Design an enzyme around this catalytic site. Sequence first.
Site, mmCIF file in Angstrom:
data_model
loop_
_atom_site.group_PDB
_atom_site.id
_atom_site.type_symbol
_atom_site.label_atom_id
_atom_site.label_comp_id
_atom_site.label_asym_id
_atom_site.label_seq_id
_atom_site.Cartn_x
_atom_site.Cartn_y
_atom_site.Cartn_z
ATOM 1 N N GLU A 54 124.444 89.298 108.064
ATOM 2 C CA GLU A 54 125.574 89.109 107.109
ATOM 3 C C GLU A 54 125.911 90.428 106.407
ATOM 4 O O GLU A 54 127.102 90.759 106.257
ATOM 5 C CB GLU A 54 125.237 88.021 106.101
ATOM 6 N N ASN B 84 129.486 92.951 106.761
ATOM 7 C CA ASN B 84 130.305 93.530 105.673
ATOM 8 C C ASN B 84 130.502 95.041 105.895
ATOM 9 O O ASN B 84 131.582 95.577 105.610
ATOM 10 C CB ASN B 84 129.698 93.194 104.310
ATOM 11 N N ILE C 270 132.055 90.620 93.926
ATOM 12 C CA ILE C 270 131.822 90.574 95.396
ATOM 13 C C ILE C 270 130.385 90.120 95.668
ATOM 14 O O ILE C 270 130.203 89.329 96.580
ATOM 15 C CB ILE C 270 132.176 91.910 96.080
ATOM 16 N N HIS D 251 128.285 81.374 110.253
ATOM 17 C CA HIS D 251 128.814 82.759 110.443
ATOM 18 C C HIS D 251 129.864 83.094 109.368
ATOM 19 O O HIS D 251 130.611 82.184 108.998
ATOM 20 C CB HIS D 251 129.357 82.950 111.860
ATOM 21 N N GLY D 252 129.910 84.349 108.878
ATOM 22 C CA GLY D 252 130.826 84.815 107.805
ATOM 23 C C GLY D 252 130.637 84.090 106.467
ATOM 24 O O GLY D 252 131.644 83.683 105.889
ATOM 25 N N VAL D 253 129.402 83.988 105.959
ATOM 26 C CA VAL D 253 128.993 83.146 104.787
ATOM 27 C C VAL D 253 129.126 83.937 103.473
ATOM 28 O O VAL D 253 129.151 83.288 102.413
ATOM 29 C CB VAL D 253 127.576 82.572 104.995
ATOM 30 N N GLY D 254 129.242 85.270 103.530
ATOM 31 C CA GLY D 254 129.466 86.138 102.349
ATOM 32 C C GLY D 254 128.141 86.678 101.812
ATOM 33 O O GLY D 254 127.128 85.955 101.904
HETATM 34 C C1 LIG Z 1 126.524 97.957 103.357
HETATM 35 N N1 LIG Z 1 127.900 97.741 102.963
HETATM 36 C C2 LIG Z 1 128.417 96.668 102.353
HETATM 37 C C3 LIG Z 1 127.639 95.556 102.063
HETATM 38 C C4 LIG Z 1 128.129 94.486 101.398
HETATM 39 F F1 LIG Z 1 127.261 93.506 101.133
HETATM 40 C C5 LIG Z 1 129.428 94.406 100.976
HETATM 41 C C6 LIG Z 1 130.303 95.436 101.210
HETATM 42 C C7 LIG Z 1 131.729 95.417 100.754
HETATM 43 N N2 LIG Z 1 132.365 94.377 100.225
HETATM 44 C C8 LIG Z 1 132.158 93.012 100.769
HETATM 45 C C9 LIG Z 1 133.435 92.114 100.914
HETATM 46 C C10 LIG Z 1 134.378 92.436 102.071
HETATM 47 N N3 LIG Z 1 133.830 92.145 103.436
HETATM 48 C C11 LIG Z 1 132.542 96.625 101.033
HETATM 49 C C12 LIG Z 1 133.958 96.721 100.505
HETATM 50 O O1 LIG Z 1 134.397 95.790 99.825
HETATM 51 N N4 LIG Z 1 134.514 97.939 100.591
HETATM 52 C C13 LIG Z 1 135.712 98.234 100.009
HETATM 53 C C14 LIG Z 1 136.644 97.270 99.589
HETATM 54 C C15 LIG Z 1 137.804 97.703 98.946
HETATM 55 C C16 LIG Z 1 137.982 99.065 98.668
HETATM 56 C C17 LIG Z 1 139.225 99.574 97.928
HETATM 57 O O2 LIG Z 1 140.159 98.796 97.779
HETATM 58 O O3 LIG Z 1 139.275 100.718 97.471
HETATM 59 C C18 LIG Z 1 137.010 99.997 99.049
HETATM 60 C C19 LIG Z 1 135.905 99.568 99.727
HETATM 61 C C20 LIG Z 1 131.971 97.762 101.754
HETATM 62 O O4 LIG Z 1 132.620 98.810 101.946
HETATM 63 N N5 LIG Z 1 130.661 97.734 102.153
HETATM 64 C C21 LIG Z 1 129.843 96.658 101.920
#
Ligand SMILES: CNc1cc(F)cc2c(NCCCN)c(C(=O)Nc3ccc(C(=O)O)cc3)c(=O)[nH]c12
Length: 196
Positions: A36, A40, A88, A94-97
């Site tokens: 998961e 991300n 966040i 799958h895709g559980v957050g």
């Molecule tokens: C190990 N990495 C990692 C682990 C994790 F648990 C979560 C994340 C994550 N958010 C999760 C929700 C989405 N799928 C981001 C994310 O939101 N990046 C991100 C979003 C917006 C902006 C902007 O608008 O400027 C800039 C960056 C990421 O980059 N890396 C992650």
Amino acid sequence: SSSIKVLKGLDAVRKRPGMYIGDTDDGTGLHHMVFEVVDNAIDEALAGHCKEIIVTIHADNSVSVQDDGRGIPTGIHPEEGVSAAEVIMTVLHHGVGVSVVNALSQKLELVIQREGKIHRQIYEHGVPQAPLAVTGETEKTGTMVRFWPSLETFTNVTEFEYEILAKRLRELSFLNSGVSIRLRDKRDGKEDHFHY
Ligand SMILES: CNc1cc(F)cc2c(NCCCN)c(C(=O)Nc3ccc(C(=O)O)cc3)c(=O)[nH]c12
């Protein structure tokens, strides 16, 4: 409202983890915690900002996932009144957050490098110890999540198996051409690099 809602969501996941992460005895749920968080990091690569993901198996049976993307946004939402990152990490999507990994972790460490600052936050059973805080300056960008799976939740298979992470990371690198994944085992120095 959000605070009450968040705690209801964490409680829901810890009460019925099989509905969120899968089987908590046979190691499938345990390894799913890693996948998961990696999914991300792969989204941030798919958005075209992350070039390298590093998955580390630590000697204390935690796993870190490091990306070199933008860094999760750190600005306090006008509405929820906590960092965008904390929303966040804690709100059930799958895709559980990742909030599911967080709920099922005894401890989770978040380190964000973004707009010239290092931000750090510690969670316990999905609950933040303190608001996200600046700890230093940096020229780098990216997000690092390290988690220690709760032994309240996971039994029997409690140690990560290198081969299981290797197979899935190799598969994710095949599905996502151009993303580069490092897997490293601090327990014995084994490593692999997956790239298609
Ligand atoms: C190990 N990495 C990692 C682990 C994790 F648990 C979560 C994340 C994550 N958010 C999760 C929700 C989405 N799928 C981001 C994310 O939101 N990046 C991100 C979003 C917006 C902006 C902007 O608008 O400027 C800039 C960056 C990421 O980059 N890396 C992650």
